[PDB]
């Protein structure tokens, strides 16, 4: 059947796509955390004087 | 015949499982064990919105972090004003079964959909000062579960007949169709570059789709029930999702492997909605235990509980500037936390 | 002195007076205990927003009227040495004791609405409920004052009078309300046995009435059928029939609080959420 | 002044305050049937006339909404059970073609036993009943099914047999009652029967509060 051929082709094309080490792709989130750690209001509270809303 | 090749490529690794065990050193927990916890996060209700008549299933914010839209089973859309608790526009509907909302970046159109298998686009700013239906897009076969905007003239939809599609609003015809699932599709998220998007499924699997070319590139698994919600980390290189098995997980794309799990022992009921924060340090999730939890993404422990809804929380949202948390439960009161 | 003074039409002269002390102490204790339990319920019915319907208003207004009437009874019924105080106190007592009975009649009206015309009505009646509970006790006082006004204060107690037959301005409406509220209790009792003893029984007539003794007992507090005991006091040997009036009608706030405020699932959950 | 827009915010609120008495006065019942049940003829003969279809009418100044789903009952997912506000489920089934009673009974069992429909009533309609008199003398019910004890020539025995088989697979005690009738094309009494079967399910909810059980 054509479905089996399509599945085999998808499996073949989903295997040779290269990879990277987990630590290198896992330190990116940690770096991004302090990349924008000062503009996050819900993390670091801001003074209430910034308008009564 | 081909079954043997499929088993060799899937059950016998062949870079699908062998390449997974050739990129992880020990665990990300070792790297993250040098970060102090966030602490105790306490949030209150600043303003409360009233006026709806039935349960709420979806809501969406705006580009200016001031106006928002929400849907209810009554069959109405209300454009609020979070600063002054004032109603600006109220739009009726032809079908009372509505599941999705949207809000154009230019602030001139509003999209909606539900069990009628048809997407509706309404024009906001026009002559004579009245809102009228502008586009009526049909052609699906299942039922819409999510729809999002790309610009003023392109909209992407996902259906319950195991398909996703992109549309041309000016003409009224499809351009590219993304097929290739087994179960229904329950969510959809757009990357912050207008180039790719991610779609979940009911077969405990998720996939990443390319818009122009129109074929899948990466598939991920590792759940045991229906996948409910999905989003992006605010960089375009990670995402996180939950399921009816009451477990949350985080996934990457470059490494192509699962990294973090969030669960407990008393969490029996499942998750409904997922949303992230500005810096990615605050993952916020809604359950059906009448509450809403906050996890820090790097760690695997709770840091805040948002109580105050009498019924089940159904929709969650955060702004672009970073100062709001909007919640909508099965009652008729939207809540804003800051 | 005593509480049966309100529903007494003939004076009584005892002998070897020992029963007056036991008729006064019980009245004091009952009113003091009921006033405390009659304020905890007003906050419950007027502050929570989940418990808001057409039946909460009736309970709220009945509780308010009873509280005002009992406070006035405690403060101003032995100020006999002053006529000007007694006239106004008697008038206020009459008004605020008629209002409670009207709000009790509205409960039977609600039972009829909820058990016969089952479907909700096109247009609201929450305004008309206020024109009948506070409208009739105004016209009644108006006509009563028009006929003879000087008869508002006695030589001993301070309310109405019995030489001019003027206490029948409070007794007639009360007995009419009681007789109507009896007809209503019956329609609920027929429906509770028939329907739930023909739809989900099986072989065996094991007294279905027992399965619903509570609720049936609880409705007696709202309908106020005990006050009839005050009519059966016409002799010195018939003390046993006024003894029970001061034992049940003074302890009405207690029952109305322990049956409709601390023995129900919805109110218990509303308290648990706040806790 | 820009702050004088509150009038608009008021004008909307009034618009949403006039329709609050139309939702509290609404009854919704969900229709379910089969291919040969006779849904079309029953629907069309009631002074009323892609996706889910909706019909609106009124009996004695009481709104009624008919929600019809076309061939989509196979959805076994849980997100599709958003019909938690319905008051009744109306099942229709035939009684002349004996070869297709088993599948219909299995579908009925699957529909009832779901946990979502625990506070709703079930109305049952047995269609035909006019072709049953002219057909029972040629086919014996003892052949396709073997649980019947009565005489296989009297209509009463087979009617009771069918009703008992349908009613013996409703489990989990009885929070709400079950009903059944015998009508094919009356189109004059069907509306009254539904009205009288939906009033009772509100008495059985009103009496619960007035009983503390």
From Swiss-Prot, chain A:
* GO terms assigned for molecular function: G-protein beta-subunit binding
State the disulfide connectivity.
Answer: none
- Name the GO terms of the biological process aspect: adenylate cyclase-activating dopamine receptor signaling pathway; cellular response to catecholamine stimulus; cellular response to prostaglandin E stimulus; fibroblast proliferation; G protein-coupled receptor signaling pathway
Q: Which residues form the signal peptide?
A: none
Q: Does the keyword Translocase apply?
A: no
Q: Name one GO cellular component term.
A: membrane
Q: Where in the cell is it found?
A: Cell membrane
Q: Which domain of life is it from?
A: Eukaryota
**Expression across tissues:** Expressed in fetal tissues, including testis, adrenal gland, brain, white blood cells and brain.
Q: What is its main location?
A: membrane
Family (UniProt): Belongs to the G protein gamma family.
Quaternary state and partners of this protein? G proteins are composed of 3 units, alpha, beta and gamma. In this context, interacts with GNB2. The heterodimer formed by GNB1 and GNG2 interacts with ARHGEF5. The heterodimer formed by GNB1 and GNG2 interacts with GRK2. Forms complexes with TAS2R14 and G-proteins; these complexes play a role in the perception of bitterness. Component of the TAS2R14-GNAI1 complex, consisting of TAS2R14, GNAI1, GNB1 and GNG2. Component of the TAS2R14-GNAT3 complex, consisting of TAS2R14, GNAT3, GNB1 and GNG2. Component of the TAS2R14-GNAS2 complex, consisting of TAS2R14, GNAS2, GNB1 and GNG2.
- Protein name, entry field: Guanine nucleotide-binding protein G(I)/G(S)/G(O) subunit gamma-2
Task: Give the source species.
Answer: Homo sapiens
UniProtKB/Swiss-Prot annotation, chain B:
| First and last residues of every WD repeat | 44-92, 93-138, 139-179, 180-221, 222-265, 266-307, 308-338
Record PTM Phosphohistidine, positions in chain: 264
Q: Name one GO cellular component term.
A: synapse
- Cross-referenced InterPro entries: G-protein_beta_WD-40_rep, Gprotein_B, Guanine_nucleotide-bd_bsu, WD40/YVTN_repeat-like_dom_sf, WD40_repeat_CS, WD40_repeat_dom_sf, WD40_rpt
Q: Does the record carry Acetylation as a key word?
A: yes
Check the record and name the PANTHER family matching this protein: GUANINE NUCLEOTIDE-BINDING PROTEIN BETA G PROTEIN BETA
SUPFAM superfamilies named among the record's database cross-references: WD40 repeat-like (SSF50978)
**GO biological process terms on file:** adenylate cyclase-activating dopamine receptor signaling pathway; cell population proliferation; cellular response to catecholamine stimulus; cellular response to prostaglandin E stimulus; G protein-coupled acetylcholine receptor signaling pathway; G protein-coupled receptor signaling pathway; phospholipase C-activating G protein-coupled receptor signaling pathway; Ras protein signal transduction
Q: Name one GO molecular function term.
A: signaling receptor complex adaptor activity
Residues spanning the membrane:
none
Q: What is the effect of changing residue 90 to T?
A: In MRD42; decreases receptor-driven G protein activation; increases trimer formation with alpha and gamma subunits; no effect on protein abundance; no effect on complex formation with gamma subunit
Give a short account of what the protein does. Guanine nucleotide-binding proteins (G proteins) are involved as a modulator or transducer in various transmembrane signaling systems. The beta and gamma chains are required for the GTPase activity, for replacement of GDP by GTP, and for G protein-effector interaction.
- Give the UniProt keywords, A-Z: Acetylation, Disease variant, Host-virus interaction, Intellectual disability, Phosphoprotein, Repeat, Transducer, WD repeat
Q: Name one matching Pfam family.
A: WD40_Gbeta
Its PTM note reads: Phosphorylation at His-264 by NDKB contributes to G protein activation by increasing the high energetic phosphate transfer onto GDP.
What is stated as this protein's family in its record?
Belongs to the WD repeat G protein beta family.
Q: What is this protein called?
A: Guanine nucleotide-binding protein G(I)/G(S)/G(T) subunit beta-1
From Swiss-Prot, chain C:
Cysteines engaged in disulfide bonds, as pairs = 86-158
Which family, according to UniProt?
A: Belongs to the G-protein coupled receptor 2 family. LN-TM7 subfamily.
Name-wise, this protein is: Adhesion G protein-coupled receptor L3
Q: Which residues cross the membrane?
A: 22-47, 56-77, 86-109, 127-149, 165-186, 213-232, 238-263
The UniProt PTM text for this protein says: Autoproteolytically processed at the GPS region of the GAIN-B domain; this cleavage modulates receptor activity.
Localization per record: Cell membrane; Postsynaptic cell membrane; Cell projection, Axon; Cell junction
Q: Where is this region: Stachel?
A: 1-14
Q: Subunit info?
A: Heterodimer of 2 chains generated by proteolytic processing; the large extracellular N-terminal fragment and the membrane-bound C-terminal fragment predominantly remain associated and non-covalently linked. Interacts (via olfactomedin-like domain) with FLRT1 (via extracellular domain). Interacts (via olfactomedin-like domain) with FLRT2 (via extracellular domain). Interacts (via olfactomedin-like domain) with FLRT3 (via extracellular domain); the interaction is direct. Interacts (via extracellular domain) with TENM1. Interacts (via extracellular domain) with TENM2.
On the Extracellular side, which residues?
A: 78-85, 150-164, 233-237
Organism the protein comes from: Homo sapiens (Human)
Q: Which superkingdom does the taxonomy of this entry point to?
A: Eukaryota
Which parts of the sequence lie on the Cytoplasmic side of the lipid bilayer?
Answer: 48-55, 110-126, 187-212
Function of the molecule: Orphan adhesion G-protein coupled receptor (aGPCR), which mediates synapse specificity. Ligand binding causes a conformation change that triggers signaling via guanine nucleotide-binding proteins (G proteins) and modulates the activity of downstream effectors. ADGRL3 is coupled with different classes of G alpha proteins, such as G(12)/G(13), G(s), G(i) or G(q), depending on the context. Coupling to G(12)/G(13) G proteins, which mediates the activation Rho small GTPases is the most efficient.
- Provide the residues annotated with a glycan attachment (glycosylation): 235
């Amino acid at each position: 059947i054509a479905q089996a051929r399509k599945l085999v082709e998808q499996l073949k094309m989903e295997a040779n796509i290269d990879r990277i080490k987990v630590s290198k792709a896992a330190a990116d989130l940690m770096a991004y955390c302090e990349a924008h750690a000062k503009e996050d209001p819900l993390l670091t509270p801001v003074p209430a004087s910034e308008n009564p809303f | 015949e081909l079954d043997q090749l499929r088993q060799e490529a899937e059950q016998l690794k062949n870079q699908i499982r062998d390449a997974r065990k050739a990129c992880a050193d020990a665990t990300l927990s070792q790297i993250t064990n040098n970060i102090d916890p966030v602490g105790r996060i306490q949030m209150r209700t600043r303003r409360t919105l009233r006026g709806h008549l039935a349960k709420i299933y979806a809501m969406h914010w705006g580009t200016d972090s001031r106006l928002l839209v929400s849907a209810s089973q009554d069959g109405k859309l209300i454009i609020w004003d979070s600063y002054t608790t004032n109603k600006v526009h109220a739009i009726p509907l032809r079908s009372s079964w509505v599941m999705t909302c949207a809000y154009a970046p230019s602030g001139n159109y509003v999209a909606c959909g539900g069990l009628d298998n048809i997407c509706s686009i309404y024009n906001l700013k026009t002559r004579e000062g009245n809102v009228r239906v502008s586009r009526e897009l049909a052609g699906h076969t299942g039922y819409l579960s999510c729809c999002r905007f790309l610009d003023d003239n392109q909209i992407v939809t996902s259906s319950g007949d195991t398909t996703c599609a992109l549309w041309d609003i000016e003409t009224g015809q499809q351009t590219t169709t993304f097929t290739g699932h087994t179960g229904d599709v329950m969510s959809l998220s757009l990357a912050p570059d207008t180039r790719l998007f991610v779609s979940g499924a009911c077969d405990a699997s998720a996939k990443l789709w390319d818009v122009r070319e129109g074929m899948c590139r990466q598939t991920f698994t590792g759940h045991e029930s229906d996948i409910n919600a999905i989003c992006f980390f605010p960089n375009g290189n990670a995402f996180a999702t939950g399921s009816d098995d009451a477990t949350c997980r985080l996934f990457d794309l470059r490494a192509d492997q699962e990294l973090m799990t969030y669960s407990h022992d008393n969490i029996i009921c499942g998750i409904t909605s997922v949303s992230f924060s500005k810096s990615g340090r605050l993952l916020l999730a809604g359950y059906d235990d009448f509450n809403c939890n906050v996890w820090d993404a790097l760690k695997a422990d709770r840091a805040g509980v948002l109580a105050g809804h009498d019924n089940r929380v159904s929709c969650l949202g955060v702004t672009d500037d970073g100062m709001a948390v909007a919640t909508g439960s099965w009652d008729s009161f939207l809540k804003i936390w800051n | 002195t005593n509480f049966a003074v309100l529903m007494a039409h003939v004076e009584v002269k005892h002998s070897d007076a020992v029963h007056d002390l036991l008729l006064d102490v019980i009245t004091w204790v009952g009113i003091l205990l009921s006033l405390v339990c009659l304020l905890i319920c007003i906050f419950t019915f007027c502050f929570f927003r989940g418990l808001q319907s057409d039946r909460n208003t009736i309970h709220k207004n009945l509780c308010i009227s009873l509280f005002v009437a009992e406070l006035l009874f405690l403060i101003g019924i032995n100020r006999t040495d002053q006529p000007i105080a007694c006239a106004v106190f008697a008038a206020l007592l009459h008004f605020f004791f008629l209002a409670a009975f009207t709000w009790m009649f509205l409960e039977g009206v609600q039972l009829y609405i909820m058990l016969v015309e089952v479907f909700e009505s096109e247009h609201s009646r929450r305004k008309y409920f206020y024109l009948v509970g506070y409208g009739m006790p105004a016209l009644i006082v108006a006509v009563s004052a028009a006929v003879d006004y000087r008869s508002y204060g006695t030589d001993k107690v301070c309310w109405l009078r019995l030489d001019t037959y003027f206490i029948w301005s409070f007794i007639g409406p009360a007995t009419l309300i009681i007789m109507l509220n009896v007809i209503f209790l019956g329609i609920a009792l027929y429906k509770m046995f028939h329907h739930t003893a023909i739809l989900k029984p099986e072989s065996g007539c094991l007294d279905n009435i027992k399965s619903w003794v509570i609720g049936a007992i609880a409705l007696l507090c709202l309908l106020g059928l005990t006050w009839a005991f005050g009519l059966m006091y016409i002799n010195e040997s018939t003390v046993i029939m006024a003894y029970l009036f001061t034992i049940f009608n003074s302890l009405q706030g207690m029952f109305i609080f322990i049956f409709h405020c601390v023995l129900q699932k919805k109110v218990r959950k509303e308290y648990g959420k706040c806790l | 002044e820009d702050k004088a827009a509150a009038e608009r915010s008021k004008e909307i609120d009034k618009c949403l305050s006039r329709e609050k008495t139309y939702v509290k006065r609404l009854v919704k019942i969900l229709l379910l049937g089969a291919d040969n049940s006779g849904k079309s003829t029953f629907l069309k003969q009631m002074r009323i006339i892609k996706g889910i279809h909706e019909y609106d009418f009124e009996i004695k100044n009481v709104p009624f909404k008919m929600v019809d789903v076309g061939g989509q009952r196979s959805e076994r997912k849980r997100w599709f059970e958003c019909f938690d506000s319905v008051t009744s489920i109306l099942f229709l089934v035939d009684s002349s073609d004996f070869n297709r009673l088993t599948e219909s009974l299995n579908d009925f069992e699957t529909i009832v036993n779901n946990r979502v429909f625990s506070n709703v009533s079930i109305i049952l309609f047995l269609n035909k009943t006019d072709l049953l008199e002219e057909k029972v003398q040629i086919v014996s019910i003892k052949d396709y099914f073997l649980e019947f004890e009565g005489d296989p020539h009297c209509l009463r025995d087979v009617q009771k047999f069918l009703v008992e088989c349908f009613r013996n697979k409703r489990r989990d005690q009885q929070q709400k009652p079950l009903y059944h009738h015998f009508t094919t094309a009356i189109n004059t009494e069907n509306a009254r029967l539904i009205f009288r079967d939906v009033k009772d399910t509100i008495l059985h909810d009103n009496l619960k509060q007035l009983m503390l059980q």
